[PDB]
Structures are given as structure tokens and as C-alpha cells.
Design an enzyme around this catalytic site. Structure first.
Site, mmCIF file in Angstrom:
data_model
loop_
_atom_site.group_PDB
_atom_site.id
_atom_site.type_symbol
_atom_site.label_atom_id
_atom_site.label_comp_id
_atom_site.label_asym_id
_atom_site.label_seq_id
_atom_site.Cartn_x
_atom_site.Cartn_y
_atom_site.Cartn_z
ATOM 1 N N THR A 101 10.260 10.179 -0.155
ATOM 2 C CA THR A 101 10.620 9.740 1.189
ATOM 3 C C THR A 101 11.912 10.422 1.658
ATOM 4 O O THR A 101 12.920 10.328 0.963
ATOM 5 C CB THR A 101 10.811 8.200 1.181
ATOM 6 O OG1 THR A 101 9.534 7.582 0.974
ATOM 7 C CG2 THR A 101 11.367 7.713 2.503
ATOM 8 N N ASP A 134 6.043 1.715 -9.180
ATOM 9 C CA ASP A 134 5.440 2.913 -8.610
ATOM 10 C C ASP A 134 5.878 4.241 -9.257
ATOM 11 O O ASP A 134 6.795 4.935 -8.779
ATOM 12 C CB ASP A 134 5.611 3.005 -7.100
ATOM 13 C CG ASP A 134 4.643 3.990 -6.470
ATOM 14 O OD1 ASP A 134 4.192 4.947 -7.142
ATOM 15 O OD2 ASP A 134 4.331 3.812 -5.281
ATOM 16 N N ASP A 175 10.963 8.593 -7.077
ATOM 17 C CA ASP A 175 10.621 7.878 -5.849
ATOM 18 C C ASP A 175 11.403 6.569 -5.776
ATOM 19 O O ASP A 175 10.877 5.537 -5.366
ATOM 20 C CB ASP A 175 9.086 7.654 -5.789
ATOM 21 C CG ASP A 175 8.552 7.401 -4.354
ATOM 22 O OD1 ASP A 175 9.255 7.652 -3.342
ATOM 23 O OD2 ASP A 175 7.400 6.933 -4.261
ATOM 24 N N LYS A 206 -3.425 -1.641 -8.684
ATOM 25 C CA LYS A 206 -3.208 -0.526 -7.760
ATOM 26 C C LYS A 206 -4.463 0.345 -7.732
ATOM 27 O O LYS A 206 -4.804 0.935 -8.741
ATOM 28 C CB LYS A 206 -1.986 0.294 -8.216
ATOM 29 C CG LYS A 206 -1.584 1.494 -7.308
ATOM 30 C CD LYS A 206 -0.413 2.294 -7.953
ATOM 31 C CE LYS A 206 -0.052 3.571 -7.160
ATOM 32 N NZ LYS A 206 0.978 4.411 -7.928
ATOM 33 N N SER A 233 0.785 -1.231 0.000
ATOM 34 C CA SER A 233 0.000 0.000 0.000
ATOM 35 C C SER A 233 0.822 1.288 0.000
ATOM 36 O O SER A 233 2.005 1.282 0.342
ATOM 37 C CB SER A 233 -0.957 -0.007 1.198
ATOM 38 O OG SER A 233 -0.257 0.311 2.392
ATOM 39 N N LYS A 261 13.600 3.896 -4.203
ATOM 40 C CA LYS A 261 13.943 3.400 -2.860
ATOM 41 C C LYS A 261 13.712 1.875 -2.880
ATOM 42 O O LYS A 261 13.053 1.382 -3.797
ATOM 43 C CB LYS A 261 13.079 4.052 -1.780
ATOM 44 C CG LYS A 261 11.586 3.921 -2.016
ATOM 45 C CD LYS A 261 10.764 4.607 -0.962
ATOM 46 C CE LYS A 261 9.303 4.606 -1.387
ATOM 47 N NZ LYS A 261 8.450 5.076 -0.228
ATOM 48 N N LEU A 297 2.451 -8.158 -12.365
ATOM 49 C CA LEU A 297 2.737 -8.706 -11.044
ATOM 50 C C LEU A 297 4.215 -9.043 -10.935
ATOM 51 O O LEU A 297 4.756 -9.674 -11.835
ATOM 52 C CB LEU A 297 1.918 -9.978 -10.830
ATOM 53 C CG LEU A 297 2.154 -10.728 -9.530
ATOM 54 C CD1 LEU A 297 1.681 -9.916 -8.342
ATOM 55 C CD2 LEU A 297 1.444 -12.064 -9.522
ATOM 56 N N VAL A 337 -3.772 1.146 -2.549
ATOM 57 C CA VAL A 337 -3.597 -0.222 -2.082
ATOM 58 C C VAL A 337 -3.417 -1.107 -3.305
ATOM 59 O O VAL A 337 -4.080 -0.893 -4.321
ATOM 60 C CB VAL A 337 -4.805 -0.683 -1.208
ATOM 61 C CG1 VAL A 337 -6.115 -0.456 -1.902
ATOM 62 C CG2 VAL A 337 -4.678 -2.141 -0.800
ATOM 63 N N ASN A 360 10.400 0.235 -3.711
ATOM 64 C CA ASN A 360 9.992 0.363 -5.102
ATOM 65 C C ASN A 360 10.848 -0.424 -6.110
ATOM 66 O O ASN A 360 10.803 -0.170 -7.332
ATOM 67 C CB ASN A 360 9.911 1.847 -5.472
ATOM 68 C CG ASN A 360 8.683 2.490 -4.916
ATOM 69 O OD1 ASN A 360 7.709 1.791 -4.554
ATOM 70 N ND2 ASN A 360 8.706 3.819 -4.794
ATOM 71 N N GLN A 377 -0.351 5.848 0.418
ATOM 72 C CA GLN A 377 -1.133 6.693 1.342
ATOM 73 C C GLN A 377 -2.636 6.362 1.536
ATOM 74 O O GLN A 377 -3.038 6.025 2.650
ATOM 75 C CB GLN A 377 -0.916 8.187 1.062
ATOM 76 C CG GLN A 377 -1.610 9.097 2.082
ATOM 77 C CD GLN A 377 -0.882 10.408 2.340
ATOM 78 O OE1 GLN A 377 0.074 10.757 1.649
ATOM 79 N NE2 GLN A 377 -1.340 11.142 3.348
ATOM 80 N N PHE A 378 -3.464 6.459 0.493
ATOM 81 C CA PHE A 378 -3.033 6.842 -0.852
ATOM 82 C C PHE A 378 -3.471 5.850 -1.976
ATOM 83 O O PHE A 378 -4.144 6.232 -2.945
ATOM 84 C CB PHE A 378 -1.519 7.113 -0.817
ATOM 85 C CG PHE A 378 -0.799 6.784 -2.080
ATOM 86 C CD1 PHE A 378 -1.051 7.484 -3.253
ATOM 87 C CD2 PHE A 378 0.176 5.790 -2.081
ATOM 88 C CE1 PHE A 378 -0.371 7.172 -4.417
ATOM 89 C CE2 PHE A 378 0.873 5.476 -3.238
ATOM 90 C CZ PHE A 378 0.601 6.168 -4.408
HETATM 91 O O1 LIG Z 1 3.386 0.144 -3.643
HETATM 92 C C1 LIG Z 1 3.351 -0.371 -2.298
HETATM 93 C C2 LIG Z 1 3.788 -1.693 -2.841
HETATM 94 O O2 LIG Z 1 2.893 -2.794 -2.836
HETATM 95 C C3 LIG Z 1 3.615 -3.826 -3.477
HETATM 96 N N1 LIG Z 1 3.470 -3.662 -4.964
HETATM 97 C C4 LIG Z 1 3.231 -2.542 -5.686
HETATM 98 N N2 LIG Z 1 3.215 -2.853 -7.003
HETATM 99 C C5 LIG Z 1 3.424 -4.193 -7.111
HETATM 100 C C6 LIG Z 1 3.500 -5.114 -8.164
HETATM 101 N N3 LIG Z 1 3.389 -4.795 -9.485
HETATM 102 C C7 LIG Z 1 3.094 -3.450 -9.985
HETATM 103 C C8 LIG Z 1 2.052 -3.593 -11.091
HETATM 104 C C9 LIG Z 1 1.563 -2.250 -11.614
HETATM 105 C C10 LIG Z 1 2.039 -1.768 -12.834
HETATM 106 C C11 LIG Z 1 1.601 -0.537 -13.315
HETATM 107 C C12 LIG Z 1 0.656 0.194 -12.608
HETATM 108 C C13 LIG Z 1 0.163 -0.298 -11.387
HETATM 109 C C14 LIG Z 1 0.617 -1.526 -10.895
HETATM 110 N N4 LIG Z 1 3.764 -6.417 -7.866
HETATM 111 C C15 LIG Z 1 3.900 -6.851 -6.596
HETATM 112 N N5 LIG Z 1 3.828 -5.987 -5.570
HETATM 113 C C16 LIG Z 1 3.584 -4.678 -5.813
HETATM 114 C C17 LIG Z 1 5.079 -3.647 -3.027
HETATM 115 O O3 LIG Z 1 5.237 -4.233 -1.735
HETATM 116 C C18 LIG Z 1 5.259 -2.141 -2.910
HETATM 117 O O4 LIG Z 1 6.184 -1.639 -1.924
#
Ligand SMILES: OC[C@@H]1O[C@@H](n2cnc3c(NCCc4ccccc4)ncnc32)[C@H](O)[C@@H]1O
Length: 278
Positions: free
Chosen positions: A179, A160, A138, A41, A20, A140, A94, A25, A143, A22-23
Site C-alpha cells: 500500500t 496477512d 505489508d 481466507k 477482504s 499497516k 480468528l 475474502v 493488518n 483484491q484478491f
Molecule cells: O485481510 C482483510 C482482512 O479481513 C479481516 N481479517 C483477515 N484475517 C483475519 C483474521 N484472522 C486471520 C486468520 C488466518 C491465518 C492464516 C491464514 C489465513 C487466515 N481474523 C479476523 N479478521 C481477519 C481484517 O479486517 C483484515 O483487514
């Protein structure tokens, strides 16, 4: 620009929560028609024009526009975008092996070779993005996602793009702020921002990969930001005593206050260590 307004549950099933903002999930999901799995997202929309909660449509459209441009092994791809009254839902690639952050926590001691194997991939992804005039803003360990954590040399993807901006005029001026531990002095000082800020963030990430310690971290966000602006970091012998001088040289050339004097992405790839708010 408008997005798909059918119910996302008509086309996808959701599963576990992956993380997640803020923002925002992020949930695992599966496309009904293909059986393929994605990460969705869910970004909360602003409920009024004057509101400070949620993400503005301008900010959402920017993120989607940038994501649509990108395809490279070291960056996430976007699959589809849905929306309704409350959310925009960005369905994308994913990445199943968890955060580099979590990784580093378990276990927490990387060799220079393990660190450079990660770094080379991050640099390749940022080379791609910067070549397209995209600043991520961003970067880090949270990400940077591993494809598979159980292999000796894990492959990674940058995720992200919530703060990402096109840099078409050498810099942008609009109070972008990530951050505290990872932001460049120009972000702290509210100066115009360009691709250089990402190179600073890379220096911070590199220091953390080698040592397990955060170079500018204070007891409060305030103190962290003041440390960053003053370039108040050093290489602790306890952590760095047997780290190569070339690794230290690399970090030193990224953690430079004047963005004009900081290594660029191309510089970083040619460097002898690499070259084969409130
Ligand atoms: O952003 C908080 C986060 O939540 C998880 N996360 C975020 N995106 C992820 C993903 N793939 C992105 C697919 C995407 C592509 C383009 C736009 C939106 C999403 N696969 C696995 N965990 C993810 C991580 O723990 C991060 O620290």
C-alpha cells in the site's frame, strides 16, 4: 505442493464476512468436529498461466510455507489449507477484536502510552519474524488485529502474509509492492528489498498512532509514492506539539531513505522510547 481437496463445507460451517483483499475474502467459520472457530481466507487461483487475475500458485505456496513456520503470541497461526479448482482456502486463527485501523478511527486520539503498548507488541512480533528471516512487506493498521477491543491495553496479532518473503540472501529482487502510504522508498524505486522495508512501515504506523494523520499521503497514489521516495514528511505542531521529543526521535530513525542507515528491529527494541501501486 498440494492441499486438502475435500469440500471445505463438509468439515466447516461459514458465517459472517470479516473482510477482504483484491484478491481474497475472509469469512468466520466453525470446525464441525471440534466446535472451534477460525477465519478462512479464500484466495482466487489463476485460471491460466498468462492471466493477471488471481494469485499464482508460486505465490500461494510461498504464503503457506511461511505461515507453517510461525508461532508467536503476536502473529496469526495457520490451522489447515484446503483447495479446489477456483480457490485455495487458508483456515487460520480468528482474531475477534477488529483492525487496529478501526480502533484508531473509533475513537481517534491515542496517548503515547497507548501508542507504545501497541507498538511494543508489533515490535515483538516483527522481532520474531525477522529473527526467522521473514520480511512481512505489508505492515499497516489494517493488518494488525486486536484480540479484544474492550480492554484498556488491547493485545494484537499481525495478519496477512500474502506479500511475505524469506530473506535468505540479505535482499530479494522481484517487484513486491504493498500500500503506497506504507511502502519504503526502496519499494517505490524498485530496488532490492530486505527486512529494512518493514522497519520503515513501522515508522509510518507509529506516526499515525500518535497523530491520526498519514505522513506521506497525497491526493493520488502517484503523489504518495513520490512523497515517500523524497522522504517528504514533517511533524505538524497541531498534531505533535505535546508529543515527546523521544517519540519523534524514534520515528525519525525509522523514516530514513538509506535502508542501511535505518534502525533495525533489535535497534528499535533498545531505543530509549521503547526500552523499559497504480
Ligand atoms: O485481510 C482483510 C482482512 O479481513 C479481516 N481479517 C483477515 N484475517 C483475519 C483474521 N484472522 C486471520 C486468520 C488466518 C491465518 C492464516 C491464514 C489465513 C487466515 N481474523 C479476523 N479478521 C481477519 C481484517 O479486517 C483484515 O483487514
Amino acid at each position: 505442493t498440494v492441499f486438502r481437496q475435500e469440500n471445505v463445507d463438509d468439515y466447516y460451517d461459514t458465517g459472517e464476512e470479516l473482510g477482504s483483499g483484491q484478491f481474497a475474502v475472509v469469512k468466520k467459520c466453525r470446525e464441525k468436529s471440534t466446535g472451534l472457530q477460525y477465519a478462512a481466507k479464500f484466495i482466487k487461483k489463476r485460471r491460466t498461466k498468462s492471466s493477471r487475475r488471481g494469485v499464482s500458485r508460486e505465490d500461494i505456496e510461498r504464503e503457506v510455507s511461511i505461515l507453517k513456520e510461525i508461532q508467536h503470541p503476536n502473529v496469526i497461526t495457520l490451522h489447515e489449507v484446503y483447495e479446489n479448482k477456483t480457490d485455495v482456502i487458508l483456515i487460520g486463527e480468528l482474531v475477534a477484536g477488529g483492525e487496529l485501523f478501526d480502533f484508531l478511527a473509533e475513537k481517534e486520539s491515542l496517548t503515547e502510552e497507548e501508542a507504545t503498548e501497541f507498538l511494543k507488541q508489533i515490535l515483538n512480533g516483527v522481532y520474531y519474524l525477522h529473527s526467522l528471516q521473514i520480511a512481512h512487506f505489508d505492515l499497516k493498521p489494517e493488518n494488525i488485529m486486536l484480540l479484544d477491543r474492550n480492554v484498556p491495553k488491547p493485545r494484537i496479532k499481525i495478519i496477512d502474509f500474502g506479500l511475505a518473503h524469506k530473506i535468505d540472501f540479505g535482499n530479494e529482487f522481484k517487484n513486491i509492492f504493498g500500500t503506497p502510504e506504507f511502502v519504503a522508498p526502496e519499494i517505490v524505486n524498485y530496488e532490492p528489498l530486505g527486512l529494512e522495508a518493514d522497519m520503515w512501515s513501522i515508522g509510518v504506523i507509529t506516526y499515525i498512532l500518535l497523530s491520526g494523520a498519514s505522513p506521506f499521503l497525497g491526493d493520488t497514489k502517484q503523489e504518495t509514492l513520490a512523497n515517500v521516495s523524497a522522504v517528504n514528511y514533517e511533524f505538524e505542531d497541531e498534531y505533535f506539539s505535546n508529543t515527546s521529543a523521544l517519540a519523534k526521535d524514534f520515528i525519525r530513525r525509522l523514516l530514513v531513505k538509506d535502508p542501511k542507515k535505518r534502525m533495525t528491529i533489535q535497534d528499535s527494541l533498545q531505543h530509549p522510547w521503547i526500552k523499559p501501486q497504480f
